[PDB]
Amino acid sequence: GLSDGEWQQVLNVWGKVEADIAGHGQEVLIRLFTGHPETLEKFDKFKHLKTEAEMKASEDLKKHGTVVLTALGGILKKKGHHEAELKPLAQSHATKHKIPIKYLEFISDAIIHVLHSKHPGDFGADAQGAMTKALELFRNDIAAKYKELGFQ
Ligand code: HEM
């Protein structure tokens, strides 16, 4: 449950991401994969990436980063009214990709890390609070769908 002012902060922060969705998406995934190498194993199409240099050079990783952040941005712009947008992602990530909710926590924190890394001094405490709450809401609603599906 975010206030109007918190959603305003979220969407203000998101404008930073939308200016360079592929660069943000790439860095989010690289942060996820390098911080939590087990997550790489969930991607048949990225498990060949042995080094961060290879990850950085991967155009397909940037492409997927764009897909991920485009989806997330579409969800965030719903300001919590995202059941229709979230449902297929929860279902695909539980049933097809088999992504534990822990990895969604990892990527949520990776987003925060990337925002500070790319916008140092420009991702204020209020913005971090609002973005964190929005990612918690996202993760929590996914978690509810995971529970429905019995997925761990
Ligand atoms: C912000 C959180 C995430 C968003 C918005 C997101 C979004 C997406 C989207 C839109 C797709 C393609 C459509 C689909 O298959 O449903 C996808 C595919 C996929 N996602 Fe995610 N995802 C997120 C987090 C994760 C995490 C944390 C993992 C694993 C650690 C993961 C693993 C995968 C895999 C393996 C695929 C299939 C990739 C392929 O083979 O093309 N996702 N994701």
Does 128 sit in the ligand 1 pocket, CB within 6 Å? Answer: no
Structure tokens at 68: 């991920």
For 110, residues 6+ apart whose C-beta sits below 8 A from its C-beta are: 28, 31, 32, 35
Is 64 annotated as ligand-binding?
A: yes
Query: Of 28, 30, 24, nearest to 46 (Cα)?
Result: 30
- Give the span between the Cα atoms of 82 and 72, in whole angstroms: 10
Name which residue sits closest to atom 35 of ligand 1, judged by CA.
43
| Resolution, Å (one decimal) | 1.4
Domain that holds residue 54: 1-152
Helix ranges (DSSP H) in 20-100: 21-35, 37-40, 52-57, 59-76, 83-91
Indicate which CATH number applies to the domain containing 78: 1.10.490.10
Does 71 sit in the ligand 1 pocket, CB within 6 Å? Answer: yes
HSE-up of 31 (CA within 13 Å, CB side)? 22
Query: Of 126, 124, 93, nearest to 6 (Cα)?
Result: 126
Is 93 annotated as ligand-binding?
A: yes
Number of domains observed in the structure of the chain: 1
